[PDB]
């Protein structure tokens, strides 16, 4: 008994009407955009809505949407009993009919395997589904203790002898682990009008950006912005930074590089070239060497950039003096 | 029944508590385990309010030895408080807490380095009145 509106819940009759309007919505949206209604799809709908209702709101949940009711409306709002009031599932009164119905099946499988009576690593590089994924399969809220108990039961199933039916079952709750390989992506090897091989790669340090063009065969002649490298870089430390890629792979005096660095200062421009050269030099080295470069810092872009000044303090971190009290 | 049933002054209390707890730990009176630990006491510091009593015991090199010594010492600290009230050392004793003192290890370290050092050459709302009106 409060002014806050009563819980808004959706019946099967309500969602059913929301799906008829959506189906009639598609036929109108198709007629607007001049497309054929039969083939009009979810992808075309989202594109049409973006043209007819251009919104530049940064958060995409707040933009106009004409989606199917299944997506927008919470799925876990379906009638669980009939007209006579008798629930449909024998575990209705537990409050977690779907979680306990699943724990009922897995416990019955375990009993038959134990009564009836090889390597268990049938699948590798897989993980157990996270609670958020499980909650989606069950379509009901689970607690952290409920998730832990389900996994322990599934593990016990794997320990026991498993027929092909059991392996398919546990597969449903095994999700492929992401295979993000931190391995450098080698650039192609183009050919010049003369016919010499060369690779190109970009590099960015602070505000400086470089575009190197390493040549497979050379005597070590580096030209920066159409100038020599001793002239362009009068500082010793800046030249050393250009030496690091080649010296590491013992490839000094074997390549001819032509660089074009714009932006930043003297040190930031040398660093930008170093990464650009290291990435272009990848095409002319063995894969074992490319990994050696990656593990020495030569292929990682440096993310350190100047931080903004903050209002009310002298600098990015420097604070105004705390006046003597 | 049973289940329900179950400046200068601080200098004097700090020194005497140290003088007595050292004796309790030199015999199996507290326990045989506590006797075998061969624990040493750096000092005792009683708080100003007397809410607690700090007992600093000279920690050792091995973390495992220290972790075991800590657990055994703490479990017996409640019983150790009983022994001091029962022998009439002090009428009131605060909850004894055992603290570590790793200075002893540092004290040995200094001598080793120092010897090797190069010194060099020398009402109306509550009432029904509003309601009754309408």
């Amino acid at each position: 008994n409060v002014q806050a509106s009563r819980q808004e819940s959706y019946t099967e009759d309500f969602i059913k009407k929301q799906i008829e309007e959506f189906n009639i919505g598609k036929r109108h949206l198709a007629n607007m955009m001049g497309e054929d209604p039969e083939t009009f799809a979810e992808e075309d709908i989202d594109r049409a809505i973006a043209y007819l209702f251009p919104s530049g709101l940064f958060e995409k949940r707040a933009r106009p949407m004409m989606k199917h009711p299944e997506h927008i409306f919470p799925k876990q709002r379906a009638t669980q009993w009939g007209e006579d009031g008798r629930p449909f599932h024998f575990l209705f009164y537990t409050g977690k009919q779907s979680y306990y119905s699943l724990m009922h099946d897995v416990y019955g499988k375990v009993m038959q395997l134990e009564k009836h009576r090889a390597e268990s690593r049938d699948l590798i590089g897989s993980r157990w589904l996270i609670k958020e994924e499980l909650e989606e399969m069950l379509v009901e809220k689970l607690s952290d203790e409920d998730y832990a108990q389900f996994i322990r039961l599934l593990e016990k199933l794997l320990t026991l002898p498993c027929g092909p039916a059991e392996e398919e079952f546990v597969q449903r709750f095994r999700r492929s682990v992401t295979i993000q390989s931190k391995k450098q992506l080698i650039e192609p090897v183009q050919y010049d009008e003369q016919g010499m091989a060369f690779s190109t790669s970009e590099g960015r340090r602070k505000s400086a950006t470089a575009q190197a063009v390493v040549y497979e065969h050379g005597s070590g002649k580096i030209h920066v912005n159409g100038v020599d490298y001793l002239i362009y870089f009068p500082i010793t430390q800046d030249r050393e930074q250009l030496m690091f890629p080649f010296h590491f792979l013992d490839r000094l005096e074997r390549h001819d590089v032509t660089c074009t660095v714009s932006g930043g200062g003297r040190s930031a421009q040398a660093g930008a070239i170093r990464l650009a050269m290291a990435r272009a030099l990848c095409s002319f080295v063995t894969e074992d060497e490319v990994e050696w470069m990656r593990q020495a810092g030569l292929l990682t872009p440096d993310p350190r950039i100047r931080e903004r000044k903050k209002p009310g303090q002298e600098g990015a971190r420097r604070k105004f003096t705390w006046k003597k009290r | 029944n049973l289940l329900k049933k179950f400046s200068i002054r601080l200098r004097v209390l700090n020194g005497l508590l140290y003088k007595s707890l050292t004796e309790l730990l030199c015999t199996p009176q507290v326990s045989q385990e506590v006797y075998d630990l061969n624990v040493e006491l750096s000092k005792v510091s009683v708080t100003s309010d007397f809410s607690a009593c700090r007992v600093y015991w000279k920690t050792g090199v091995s973390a495992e030895q220290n972790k075991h010594t800590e657990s055994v010492l703490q479990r017996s600290a409640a019983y150790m408080r009983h022994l001091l009230i029962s022998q009439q050392t002090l009428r009131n004793v605060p909850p004894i807490v055992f603290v570590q003192d790793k200075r002893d290890l540092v004290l040995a370290e200094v001598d080793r380095l120092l010897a090797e050092a190069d010194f060099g050459p020398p009402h109306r709302d509550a009432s029904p009145r509003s309601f009754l009106l309408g």
Binding site: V2, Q3, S55, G56, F58, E59, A62 | -
Partner: protein
């Protein structure tokens, strides 16, 4: 604490609209702009004049439709045309709206010397985004 344009929490009985619920830092993220003109774009003139005209147009519509406005009005300038889009409660008779539309349009076209049109969407009652 920041007090700017925030409808503060009550005890769950205050009905705030979508516009009222969102604080200033959600501008351009979850809620858009009530006025759309070209005067605040880069290298454009007459920002001061467009902003003053909007302030008046908002006070004028409130007084001309007193208690009949469900939400803040939306102002759209295209070329020299001004367009006022207001959600209005269905309190007044229908013919009274036809009078206030004819009056408010003619009066505002002769005051700012531009074509002004009024677009009214009638709601049965204020739309409540959430109870706070």
């Amino acid at each position: 604490k920041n007090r700017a344009a925030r409808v503060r929490v009550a005890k769950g009985n205050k009905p705030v609209s979508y516009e009222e619920a969102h604080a200033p830092h959600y501008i351009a993220h979850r809620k858009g702009w009530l006025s759309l003109h070209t005067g605040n774009l880069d290298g454009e003139d007459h920002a001061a004049e467009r902003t003053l005209e909007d302030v008046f147009l908002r006070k004028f519509m409130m007084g001309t439709f007193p208690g009949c406005l469900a939400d803040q009005i939306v102002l759209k300038r295209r070329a020299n045309q001004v367009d006022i889009c207001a959600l209005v409660l269905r309190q007044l008779p229908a013919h009274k709206f036809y009078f206030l539309v004819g009056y408010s349009e003619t009066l505002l076209s002769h005051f700012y010397k531009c074509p002004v049109r009024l677009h009214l969407q009638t709601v049965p009652s204020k739309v409540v985004y959430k109870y706070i």
